[PDB]
Symmetry: D2
Subunit: 236 residues, 4 copies
């Protein structure tokens, strides 16, 4: 059983959050990627914020899988028409470090991003940029990734919400018995996105893992991701 709550990141979350890549706290929020003194986000950057304590995903001698829930708010600071690349919530082995930037969201490497058998990561992505390098929706989208940058299921993410300049609330749940991952993205306006898909953690990740949030950028400099709050709870 694991749980934590960050109403904000004003306190010294140093002894509770592992910062990878560019990740760090900025004025009570988590800023995954670096910006210059002029507030302009740097190109090809990546960062991740992983919770220190590990999570018992499942048991082998019991085959019993754990359930978990996470909720976090984020703001997309967009100053252009081509924001990239987005952010993602994810689970990975405790020693997993930041990977490639750009379309890989700091989760995979260029060489194996499309090879599930060569990865150990499950994530829900909020993709603000359609990439031609591999198969994916031609529109902004939300998706569930199982050991691959190519989502197993996606949902269209409206630009009116992406460029809304409003605080979004992401909720992700997983029922260990049913083996179902669900994501709900909500905007203060009146729009909710719902995406669910069956996924068995036992065949995609080790018994013990860490949870975190990742973000990255490519050539454009029109986007900076900020996480305002974050809580999580898990039960075997």
């Amino acid at each position: 059983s694991v749980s934590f709550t960050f109403p904000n990141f004003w306190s010294d979350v140093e002894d509770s959050i592992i910062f990878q890549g560019d990740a760090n706290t900025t004025a009570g929020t988590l800023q995954l990627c670096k910006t210059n003194q002029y507030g302009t986000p740097l190109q090809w950057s990546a960062g991740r914020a992983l919770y220190s304590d590990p999570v018992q995903l499942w048991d082998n001698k019991t085959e019993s899988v754990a359930s978990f829930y996470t909720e976090f708010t984020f703001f997309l600071k967009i100053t252009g028409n081509g924001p990239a690349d987005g952010l993602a919530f994810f689970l990975a082995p405790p020693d997993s470090d930041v990977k490639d930037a750009g379309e890989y969201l700091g989760l995979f490497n260029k060489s194996t991003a499309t090879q599930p058998s060569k990865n150990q990561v499950v994530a829900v992505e909020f993709d603000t940029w359609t990439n031609p390098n591999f198969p994916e929706p031609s529109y902004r989208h939300i998706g569930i990734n199982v050991n691959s940058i190519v989502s197993v299921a996606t949902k269209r993410w409206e630009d009116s919400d992406i460029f809304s300049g409003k605080i979004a609330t992401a909720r992700i749940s997983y029922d260990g018995s049913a083996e179902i991952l669900t994501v709900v993205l909500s905007y203060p306006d009146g729009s909710d996105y719902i995406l669910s898909h069956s996924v068995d953690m036992r065949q995609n990740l080790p018994e013990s893992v860490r949870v975190g949030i990742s973000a990255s950028t490519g050539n454009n400099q029109f986007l900076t991701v900020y996480i305002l709050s974050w809580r999580f709870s898990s039960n075997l």
Copy 2:
């Protein structure tokens, strides 16, 4: 596309909410079942609060199913050791009225509660009382009901949370493409319940329906359910 938000029920929600059975507003909240002048809940009562506007669940000539999300907070005013019977969120034909009280949660009739083919209702229940009349967990529980008072899937609901005297937050989502219903129950302490199950609305409900919240009581008078807030959104 349908959506609404009730941060509270202080306003005159008369021209937006259909009250069934005992249901009504009480000091900014929805109180489904009646209590006396001494605050004591009456026995064998039932009540439902349905949103006026109908929701397009699915399309026949398109086979396309809609997705929706709902969130609401509730408080369990318990004054004894045997609180019953609980509450539930549900979807049913627009002309569906309150049914039997007690273990039926105002959703089914005594005679057909266990006969799916004789019902038109999908619900997520928060059952505070184990009934011997039909099969169900011997402990307090949360469940998904598909045209029957006998849940297709359940999750244990800890008494420490039920008798916590705290405001609970219920979240229910449905992905029309994946045909998955998910429920998350959260307590300000640090406990989250997650329950997901595949369910196809097309074979359980008509194209157009109404959403609502229901509650009922039996012989005991140790429980009074109050809904503090409620919002919903749906998209075809």
Copy 3:
């Protein structure tokens, strides 16, 4: 050095709040005056909710009036054009009990309401009814009462806010050194009422007092006051 916080009144505030007259808790709120089973407020009723623990207002040889701050939210459920009589925050001797209803706000008796030397109560009133019995604004108003139902200072209270059907936030502060009482009434719309006046508690109240909120009604039955939250802190 006394302080307390009530984010709501869902818990059993029995062993912390002294209920006088009709006062009691109702669905997470404080309802000072009673209503029938039809939700209709009874005529000529009065009620007060005083915090159990007494507050040290001042001292003699020590010479040091205590400072305090209190904040609370309330809703005016109005169903007619003649709401009466309103509510008030007050300080009085620990053994002070509810007084007369109607225009006296449960704070004074009919025979001495206009005689300062015969009373022991300082209060901030939110008067929704202009009375001709004694001098007072011919319009709804907010006021500072020092041992009298006749305010020493008042501020007009716009009807657009009174019948707004929105939750109001009251803030009352007192600087024991400057001997100044300040009241600020705020509405979510965009209106703030400010009223300050010099007042020396030492010559109007005993060294030890209790703080509370009261309300009352007269002939009309168009108003029911509800207090949703309440907090207070003091320092000698």
Copy 4:
């Protein structure tokens, strides 16, 4: 009759807020003074954020000082034992620009900071550093400044709250009729600071003024002030 509300500073408040000195927005907040790429605050810096629209303070032949109320939250990011210099809310002529840093809080010049007749500024200061250059409390404090860096009235500000690492809420009100300025500083823990003092804006400021918040630093580099939200309303 001017009013504005900033629940945060995530939006482009460019066409609503005049940034002076180092002031600017940082991740949804206002950062008055600059910090390097290492998050270290620069020495001897100053910045102010004034609301664009001017406020009508008072009139002559009309005789009617306007009343106003303002509320804002701020966080003191402290990394050392000598945080300086603090922040302040103020009113000054519309064309007033940032002044000297250090102990002057960006509000006065070194040569005239102690000369009321040479200044046009009324403010509430939150001084985290006792200066020996001029008379002031030998302990951290809150104060009301009338055309001088030497407060006419002050209140001790406990270090437990200053180094608390929690978000503080400041509330400032002014009754134009009573000519009374009141400040209330509140911490989520359970401490409220109250300070009131008589002040006539008519003899200290022009008929039209601008309101804002300022901050500054000296030699030490242990403090960085952040304003998370800010709202204000006024009425002639």
